[PDB]
Amino acid sequence: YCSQGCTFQCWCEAGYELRPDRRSCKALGPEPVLLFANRIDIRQVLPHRSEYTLLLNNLENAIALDFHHRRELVFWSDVTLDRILRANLNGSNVEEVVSTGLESPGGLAVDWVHDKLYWTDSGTSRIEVANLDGAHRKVLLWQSLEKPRAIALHPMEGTIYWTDWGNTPRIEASSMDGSGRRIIADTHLFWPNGLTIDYAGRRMYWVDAKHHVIERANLDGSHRKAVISQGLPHPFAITVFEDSLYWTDWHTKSINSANKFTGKNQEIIRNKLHFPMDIHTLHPQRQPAGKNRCGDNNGGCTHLCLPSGQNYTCACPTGFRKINSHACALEVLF
């Protein structure tokens, strides 16, 4: 639809150049790479060519994953080991991040702006946050959570989106401090497995594996649309780049692709995969630079500085109580 926007002429945004078709915005910089967890592996695949890049070689059960493009890091969850890990993007030096309090860590999200990590546990029915190293861990959300699975962030807007496939399945959003919580869609869902935000396109996409649909809504949940109504036997995770959607399917053990607008150009990027799980488009434009709300006043308040609404707030790591608005103290002192 003239891709990003047309105010006729077509308008591209920075990091994107208008293609001769005059509609398409091709991404500036390196080539896009599909990053996914094969449960036993984490592989980088080039989508419109045939490629296999073995990143992490020996794993028990990798599901949720994400990256910090600047700083070149790869985070992923292991649900058998019940640990969260990180490594350089090249796949060097595996490092434990979250070693405790995990049961079924199904979601993972990295804030490249504020350098924070958000993850969901369907077993613990909680959403948690910490520093990229694992420091200053806090429980962001707990009450009224069942099976939180997919999680995506909007560091620029300081907003968090996630999915719950529990007894009352829903897609929800809150500020990165856990405030301003609202329902995005609590209707016509059953298995909301995956979620993704198109930053340039300013829209959100999700998959329901029971309804076998990929849906686009505006970013507040408005103008809900199903873009793909077929060939979705058991989809799991979904991602976006340019005019294409990419997702993994458990039935076909494959990475699939189609057009965000028309839903056409159905494609199988790869198949015969062990057990494809979570997927991201590895590219600088998929992690757009933005204003750091917490950066350069006092770094992360005393402990945690989290974006809230039009501003930021200071929060206490678990085991801490708040001292005024800027500080925290341990729970055993008082």
Binding site: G123, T124, S125, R126, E146, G166, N167
Partner: protein
């Protein structure tokens, strides 16, 4: 086998399988429960009813309860932390027998009525055990609710028939195991 029938005023009390120290030489005790499993068959015309109560007779809440809400079954239990409620999609009343598989391991619990896909979920984190006073109640309760804000259906006696009672891995004897024997009837033939 056998069928216990319930008029709505029928509330039958059973003890949880005890330690026989006589035979085992094992120190007698009753600890709070790690896991529960209940298998039972049900036939009813009723829309709402409290059916099963595994509970602690202290008025603070530790309970495991299977009850009918609006024709559909519910499994709910409070472990010390807040409760979890699991609704069976299947409707209780065609006046036809239905198989019930209720189970919980710590927080995680499941419910399956008939051939439906089982309904899973977990009670809130924290307490993973169920405080117990050796009481297993059937047909609803004597109108001895515990001062909890439960659905008003849990105060209503159960109307219908039961059979094939399995508590854990033990087959329950409907008549002989009852500590409380108000009156006992085989299920009528509707």
């Amino acid at each position: 086998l056998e069928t216990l029938a319930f008029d709505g005023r029928t509330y039958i009390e059973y003890l949880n399988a005890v330690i026989e120290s006589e035979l085992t030489n094992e120190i007698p005790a009753e600890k709070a429960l790690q896991s529960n499993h209940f298998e039972l068959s049900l036939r009813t015309e009723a829309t709402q009813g409290l059916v099963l109560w595994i509970g602690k007779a202290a008025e603070r809440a530790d309970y495991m309860a299977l009850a009918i809400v609006d024709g559909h079954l519910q499994l709910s239990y409070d472990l010390g932390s807040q409760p979890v409620v699991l609704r069976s999609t299947v409707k209780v009343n065609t006046n036809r027998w239905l198989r019930i598989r209720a189970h919980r391991e710590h927080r995680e619990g499941s419910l399956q009525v008939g051939n439906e896909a089982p309904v899973t979920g977990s009670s809130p984190l924290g307490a993973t055990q169920l405080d117990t006073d050796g009481a297993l109640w059937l047909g609803g309760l004597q109108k001895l609710p515990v001062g909890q804000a439960l659905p008003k259906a849990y105060g209503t006696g159960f109307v219908g028939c039961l059979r094939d009672v399995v508590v854990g891995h033990r087959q329950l004897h409907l008549l002989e195991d009852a500590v409380t024997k108000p009156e006992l009837r085989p299920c009528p033939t509707p």
